[PDB]
Ligand binder design. Structure first.
Ligand SMILES: *[C@@H]1O[C@H](CO)[C@@H](O[C@@H]2O[C@H](CO)[C@@H](O)[C@H](O)[C@H]2NC(C)=O)[C@H](O)[C@H]1NC(C)=O
Ligand code: NAG
Ligand code: NAG
Ligand code: NAG
Ligand code: ZN
Length: 596
């Protein structure tokens, strides 16, 4: 017979085995995460080792299958995603060296701490001490000391480890017939199967550069406004026409500017919308929050939650008989099992995180009939986008008013609108240049255009160009500041947090185009709409069987990355910032430095 039927039978056998194998592995990981002990860790390790061995064996048996002679799309994409394991391309010495380097970097990041001067015993860890310090303290010297200590503790020790890591990664990428590790990361967006506009790994960088250049005006206005607002609390630490200090962005690295909201609030006289008070007054619990989320989701013609999700997930902290580290995760155990692990409290942030997790669960249930290799999003930016569009549609005051959470006598004037827009921009807009510059620096380091003896010499250059922030103290070639982030020194991609921002606002407005919404975009509501829900479900059910460009154009009528919806959403805040910056300089000076 032909190779097509042989590959089909091989994939059928592989799926029939991997279903049960991944089911057992997911059960083990869930028993570990929900019951921390010493034997559960061993069981999870055995399950993971078995799953990895099976995956490697299937990759070896699939490598001998030619993709050129095969004409079908599903089997071709399945063999393509199966052949990309990563581990079995090198010898044992380099593999063990890379594994030891990864484990050492993870241990250094987990046990990293900063010791205050003149106190060798009072050393504070990163979480939750350093995070709280960088997010709540409004002092210059304290934040500067914390940043310098974290840098000198993490990068100074991870520099040679990161050097060997990037060397081994580039060598493995060259072994996998790839250009560099940046190519191995960008291979996720490459869909060489659509007849016509086929997306390539080189077009992704160009599209990201174009969308960054298009965001540049709004981000520059926002940065100028934040600088003008922070100039009141920092009279001699921030120049009006220069860059901003890196240790004053709300956290240790500057990924989110939300912590700067009390200092950059447009109108401090009006309080923000708070729901936890009405929830505590009306006697709300986790079950009520989840039932309200299920009702909101089924009002958009989406399926409801199954009884297994209700009697198997961990919606509340059990306590008194177990110890767990609970972070919001929408887990898919396979075979039609979907659970949510989260210690949801009676608040508003947890109220939105519940809707986020329910959207993630709905997205996972959308492709429940797709093959195991296609039981995921088309790219790494659709999951979080689908999770965030629901939170955007829920956080509107209309949903809180017509459902019994906010008083009907709440006047919605432009002050609260500007406040909400600025609060959203401090979290969504302030991360795009940071993510872009981090991914570009990592790609250029993988490609070899930045020699080691100049790595940092470039890291602080783009910081002044792309983001517009200047370092507080000069760093020589012994620091490895970029590795101070969790996602950087963990073999984790970072562009997934960028494209989602484009993929989120594109979807929302699109739904608002079907629900016949009129007026501003920040007052949209997808609830009580069957037409938009049908298109949403049809877009979510495709999973990974089709190219991401086709899935995008089947939802927003555009087969390319477009940041237009983001500008249309932030147009009110854009005009407000343009009117406010009439007495301030827009832009930053690349040559200015705080230490002169
Ligand atoms: C979706 O529509 C339904 C019905 O049109 C809304 O439900 C009503 O809420 C009012 C009070 O605001 C009650 O008096 C009605 O009895 C409710 N009807 C039903 C059938 O329950 C619902 O609030 C709408 N949802 C949103 C988010 O606007
Ligand atoms: C959790 O683990 C402990 C010991 O590891 C065991 O005694 C207990 O029954 C487990 N709980 C559940 C719900 O399985
Ligand atoms: C590809 O295979 C799937 C199932 O393996 C089948 O449903 C589909 O029709 C095939 N496509 C073509 C073009 O043969
Ligand atoms: C949920 O599962 C438990 C067993 O863990 C069972 O005792 C209980 O009856 C179940 N509840 C429902 C509503 O099925
Ligand atoms: Zn999520």
């Amino acid at each position: 017979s032909t190779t097509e039927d042989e590959a089909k039978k091989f994939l059928d056998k592989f799926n029939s085995k991997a279903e049960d194998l991944s089911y057992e592995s997911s059960l083990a990981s869930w028993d570990y995460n929900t019951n921390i002990s010493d034997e559960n860790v061993q069981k999870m390790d055995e399950a993971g080792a078995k799953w990895s061995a099976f995956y490697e064996e299937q990759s070896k048996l699939a490598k001998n299958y030619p993709l050129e002679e095969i004409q079908n799309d599903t089997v071709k994409r399945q063999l393509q995603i199966l052949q990309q394991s990563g581990s079995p391309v090198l010898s044992e010495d380099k593999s063990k060296r890379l594994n030891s380097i990864l484990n050492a970097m993870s241990t250094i990041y987990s046990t990293g701490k900063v010791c205050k001067p003149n106190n060798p015993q009072e050393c504070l860890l990163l979480e939750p001490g350093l995070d709280n310090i960088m997010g709540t303290s409004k002092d210059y010297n304290e934040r500067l000391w914390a940043w310098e200590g974290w840098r000198a503790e993490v990068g100074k020790q991870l520099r040679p480890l990161y050097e060997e890591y990037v060397v081994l990664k580039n060598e493995m990428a060259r072994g996998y017939h790839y250009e560099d590790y940046g190519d191995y990361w960008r291979r996720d967006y490459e869909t060489e199967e659509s007849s016509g506009p086929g997306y390539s790994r080189d077009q992704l960088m160009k599209d990201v550069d174009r969308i960054f250049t298009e965001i540049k005006p709004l981000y520059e206005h926002l940065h100028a406004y934040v600088r003008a607002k922070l100039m009141d609390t920092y009279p001699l630490h921030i120049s009006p026409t220069g860059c901003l200090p890196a240790h004053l962005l709300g956290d240790m690295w500057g990924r989110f500017w939300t912590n700067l909201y009390p200092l950059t609030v447009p109108f401090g006289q009006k309080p923000n919308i708070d729901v936890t008070d009405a929830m505590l007054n009306q006697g709300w619990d986790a079950n009520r929050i989840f039932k309200e989320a299920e009702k909101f989701f089924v009002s958009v013609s989406l399926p409801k939650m199954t009884e297994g999700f209700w009697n198997k997930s961990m919606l509340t902290e059990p306590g008194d008989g177990r110890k767990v580290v609970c972070h919001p995760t929408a887990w898919d155990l396979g075979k039609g099992d979907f659970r949510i692990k989260m210690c949801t409290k009676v608040t508003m942030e947890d109220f939105l995180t519940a809707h986020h997790e329910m959207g993630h669960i709905q997205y996972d249930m959308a492709y429940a009939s797709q093959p195991y290799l296609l039981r995921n999003g088309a790219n790494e930016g659709f999951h979080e986008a689908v999770g965030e569009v629901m939170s955007l549609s829920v956080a509107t005051p209309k949903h809180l008013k017509t459902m019994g959470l906010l008083s009907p006598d709440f006047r919605e004037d432009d002050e609260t609108e500007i406040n909400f827009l600025l609060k959203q921009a401090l979290n969504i807009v302030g991360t795009l240049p940071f993510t872009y510059m981090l991914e570009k620096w990592r790609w250029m380091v993988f490609k070899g255009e930045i020699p080691k003896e100049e790595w940092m010499k470039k890291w602080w250059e783009m910081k002044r160009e792309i983001v517009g922030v200047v370092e507080p103290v000069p760093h020589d070639e012994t620091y490895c500041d970029p590795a101070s982030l969790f996602h950087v020194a963990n073999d984790y991609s970072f562009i997934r947090y960028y494209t989602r921002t484009i993929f989120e606002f594109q979807f929302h407005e699109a739904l608002c185009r079907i629900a016949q919404h009129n007026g501003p975009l920040h007052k949209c509501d997808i609830s009580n709409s069957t037409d938009a829900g049908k298109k949403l479900h049809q877009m979510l059910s495709v999973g990974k069987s089709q190219a991401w460009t086709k899935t995008l154009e089947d939802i927003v009528d555009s087969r390319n990355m477009d940041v237009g919806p983001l500008l249309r959403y932030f147009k009110p805040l854009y005009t407000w910032l343009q009117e406010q910056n009439r007495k301030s300089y827009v832009g930053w000076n690349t040559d200015w430095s705080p230490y002169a």
